[PDB]
Amino acid sequence: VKKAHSFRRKTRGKLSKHPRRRGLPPLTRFLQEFEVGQKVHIVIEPSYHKGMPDPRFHGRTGTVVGKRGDAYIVQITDGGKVKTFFIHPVHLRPQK
Amino acid sequence: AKLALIRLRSGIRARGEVRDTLAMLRLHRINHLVIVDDTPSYRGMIQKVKDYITWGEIDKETLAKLLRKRGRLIGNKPITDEYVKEKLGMTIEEFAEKVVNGEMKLRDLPNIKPVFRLHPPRGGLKGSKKRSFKEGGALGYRGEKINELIERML
RNA sequence: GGUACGGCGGCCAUAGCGGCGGGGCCACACCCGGUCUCGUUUCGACCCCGGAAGUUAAGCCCGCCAGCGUUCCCGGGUGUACUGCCCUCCGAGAGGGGGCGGGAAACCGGGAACGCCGCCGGCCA
């Protein structure tokens, strides 16, 4: 049967943890800062449900083009299209 | 070192990546030969096209013969001792010796075409086009034995 | 310069769990009371308040133990299982073989490991 895409479809593994992390992350990640032009990996922490991008884009690398509130504005390319996301720094990781 | 690559097989019934890599190597047609410098970035592409080409390490005398008999300039004009002696200060044997053992690039000749277009081998390929040279066939890595084949194709 | 002293942290088990043995100006705890601050759907036990007669026994500090768990290394297992590309190779078929490239898991034997780093303070002399 045909089934539409939703936020948590086929996310069993990708939004799961190994049972030796299991909880609140350390706080450096919560308190990261970023500059415009910095490349960032999109890596979702499944224990924090605010500022969560669609898991479809988990594993990609984008560029920061600004801030709004505590969230950063990240651009990616999907085909020819450019897409824009508001992501909490906990779901992000810098390149290098 | 300098590697000589000869194209042996058709691209009908090959994958598009293979076709594109051969085009990047300037090996568009059968029985065409290119000279390349040995590096990881070229070795990867060779490994990708391994089943459509032969390759090996070329020698200075064979390179000089090849420059004299099949070397061409823009316009498909042939290369001559006088042209060389003029635009540079060597003979062909000296230029090719250098090119082989470093110290000069082929491109250092103005208006030199990078593709050597050969004729098929005298007496035939002495192996099957469907197999590797090591197991008795024609395809893949030779060594100094690529020079024997070039001479038959020259 | 010293101190078997303490506060705020980082990396989050090579740091844990457990066992053994040692210590007390300063310090850190346990300890006695509860009128008052706060409170016990009953107990001043726990939280809070007031202070030290008194204790090194516990926590804490110090050193050790390879017992459990954890991470790393060398060698075997083994270039084994699996696998990307090509094949007028085999085989009735399934399924296998050859060339060029990648490459485990269990298990076995032998070694390292019973935390590392940052900031400011206190006390003795």
Added chain:
RNA sequence: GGUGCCCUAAGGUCGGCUCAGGCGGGUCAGGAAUCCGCCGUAGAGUGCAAGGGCAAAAGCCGGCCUGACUGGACCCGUAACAGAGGCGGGUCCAGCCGCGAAAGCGUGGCCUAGCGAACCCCUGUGCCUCCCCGGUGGGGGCCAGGGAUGACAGAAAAGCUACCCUGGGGAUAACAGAGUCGUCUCGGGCGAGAGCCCAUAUCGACCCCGAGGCUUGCUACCUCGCUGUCGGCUCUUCCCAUCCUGGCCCUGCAGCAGGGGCCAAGGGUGGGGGUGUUCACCCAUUAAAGGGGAACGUGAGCUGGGUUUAGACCGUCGUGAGACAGGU
């Protein structure tokens, strides 16, 4: 495997605490449970499925509250890449507020299901407007909420045709062909054993390996105005997987006979009764009265009994018109 809900708390926030089970202690029939200690990485619990997440909590126990609000902006998904009305979610700016010592959090439910265009209508709210001008009653417009289309991107909606018609279709059934062989038919391996005793004269379990495409099914490659017909009569030819006729072998072969096997397809294999029958059943003879293939051979060769076109009767079903892979 679940939803088309439920909750003034199961919503917001602050504080404090830690679960299931097991063991050892006591009153108790299974005892549901109340009491004490230890161990104990979550085995518990969470408004609800499944998966994910969570331990000085996102769980338990309490206290104060109503951010389950107003005005607006930009993003993601449904619908990758690659277009979308409506729906859902995210990040913020202001306003007015809640919890809190404060930092902070709060735009319902720890995350992902719980619903819906145009046109018309009802309610709230304050403004614009109605044909020369000005009043009164009434009407129209802008904004917000609500009333439904589950065939859920949304017609207001029951049947028969055998008296049937048109346009088309092998994109799609009946039939011959083609494919396949579960099923079927015909075999085999081993040997449980049965046979006075003796595995294999004869019979051979349960498991395992195959041939054929003449039995039925499966599929949908060919053919929709090629011929669509079953059976019988007539006429020709082919196979052997042999009933009789010729020749042999073993036997639980005395003879007469039987049983089981090998070679062999040159010849034979008939006549009648009831039924449309093929088949099957029966009778008298007979050396025996074998079976299959050839578009289930053979309707530009015959027949037309059967095969529910148009007429008619019975039964049954149906309000009825009518129908019946039922009969006449």
Added chain:
RNA sequence: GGGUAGAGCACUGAUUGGGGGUUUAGGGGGCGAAAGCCUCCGGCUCCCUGUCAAACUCCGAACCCACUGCCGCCGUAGAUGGCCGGAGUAGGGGGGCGGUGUAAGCCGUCACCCGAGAGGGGAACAACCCAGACCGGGGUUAAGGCCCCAAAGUGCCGGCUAAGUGUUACUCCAAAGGGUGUCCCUGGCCUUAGACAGCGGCCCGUCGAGGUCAGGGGCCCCGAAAAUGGACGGGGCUUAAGCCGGCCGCCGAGACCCCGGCGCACGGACCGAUUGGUCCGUGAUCGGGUAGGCGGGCGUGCCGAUGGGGCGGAAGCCGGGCCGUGAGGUCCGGUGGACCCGUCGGUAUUGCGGAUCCUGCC
């Protein structure tokens, strides 16, 4: 960044047997004076042994994806990209991968081919092998092949097969189980007398030289029955014209090399009544094509202009030549007896093989 293959039992759930400890959640009885102090078939917690997972994971590839820098390729002869406009396409198939299904098939996926793709081979063959095609010539190779049909070997060396087995890369080939039929590699027990073969009650004289049991491989044999007359493509082939392990020369495409000719694309120079032309340069990186888009040319009837032809014979018709890729143009001869053509610019009932097309003739 990711949990597939593989692997394993650390979670969830399945699953054999033993050796022990608590005994009982519980019906059976036994000495059961009665659920009894105590045991029997059974539950709980260990240890050793043996098995599993599409909806399990203490582990964990090959591979794929995004991004950074470099190598390579494309790009000022203007890419990537954006705007405007014109479409066609909504029945796909072969081959490889997955799920389902006895299977044939059904449903998806990759995007090499057929569709829309000539030529050389496989006997003929949509998609299996070689190889992508302007024209005229000369050469070398590919796939495969070399007894005759049929271009090129009755080719060479070592060995196997006796069944016409075979003479089949694929499209288009029957097993479980048996035979030591023959050629080979191994391992144990025998062997100065062993396996029988004879005279007699293990052996003396006997024969005297190798024998016997096990495992393994190569080729073949059995298992193996159908309908018109017949298929390694045919003839036929047996130290092969079959098979295995290797080798040596030849034949064979439109592919590759060379010479000449045509066109296209881009750039440039020059000459022009105006969508142009002659020439030069570059082209290993231009030269197949269905639906479909774009560019330039040929032909037909009438008008405004311009140049012309015709009784010393127009149009039309029959037969022949030359030019032109070509659609077509023009000349010669014959028949005929009154009108016709070229160029520039406009206009249109403007081009037929087919509609079970229409009218007429045969």
Added chain:
RNA sequence: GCCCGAAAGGGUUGACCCUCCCCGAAGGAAACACGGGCGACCGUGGAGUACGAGGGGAGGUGACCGGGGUUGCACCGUCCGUCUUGGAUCACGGGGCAGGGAGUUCACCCGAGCGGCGAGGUUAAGGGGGUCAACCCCGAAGCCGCAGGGAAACCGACAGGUCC
């Protein structure tokens, strides 16, 4: 191979054919002298010679050639149009010949190739003249544009300040 010819095609101002000299792309021999290999064969030198598409020259000869009709031998070749994944099909249409026979016109909208005027552009109906359906002059009514936003009442802007 048999047959026929016009002269529009060519040709005695030289058809065809024969021999010799020069240059020659890619490609490329053999005999022969030695040697390697059990052999089928190979290497060396002969030799990049002799040849070789083609590009030029010189002499002997003296009349055809190109073409056309029909036909023999060898090699190759399953008609045309159509839907269809797939056509020589036992899928549909298809005896022969000649003439006929299918993207037209108007109104509105979107674009383009060119041309005229230009902050303005353009006339309609109609009228006047003439050599009278052709030609010349007049005629801006209206339409688009020059300022928009807003349901409506209503309100009502940079003819240039900075940078790449």
